[PDB]
Symmetry: C2
């Protein structure tokens, strides 16, 4: 595993600031980053209340 | 740190429901929400679980 990067966090935040909101795929596309790393950073940031998401809580289920 | 036992407990719980939010899963399993979410997203990567909606919209708080 690789550690969390505050630089990536800040890049994500800068991107989101310019939008009404964005899905992780678009964030990753703009940043030229992996969607997985972007998501990984988004979750952690959400824990610190640095980002939010709609809806707040998804419903999980089985395939 | 991912436990397959925790994964299986989550799956067993989700099986009996139409679906559930992480808070309810955590409370039912007697676990913390953070751990449950960790396992849920890890399993999501592997396609062992899914969520509605699949792609949330992220934004900044004010």
């Amino acid at each position: 595993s690789n550690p969390i990067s505050e630089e990536m966090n800040l890049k994500i935040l800068a991107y989101l600031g310019t939008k009404q909101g964005a899905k992780a795929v678009h964030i990753a596309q703009s940043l030229g980053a992996q969607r997985s790393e972007v998501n990984r950073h988004l979750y952690r940031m959400s824990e610190d209340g640095r980002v939010r998401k709609h809806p707040q809580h998804p419903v999980w289920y089985l395939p």
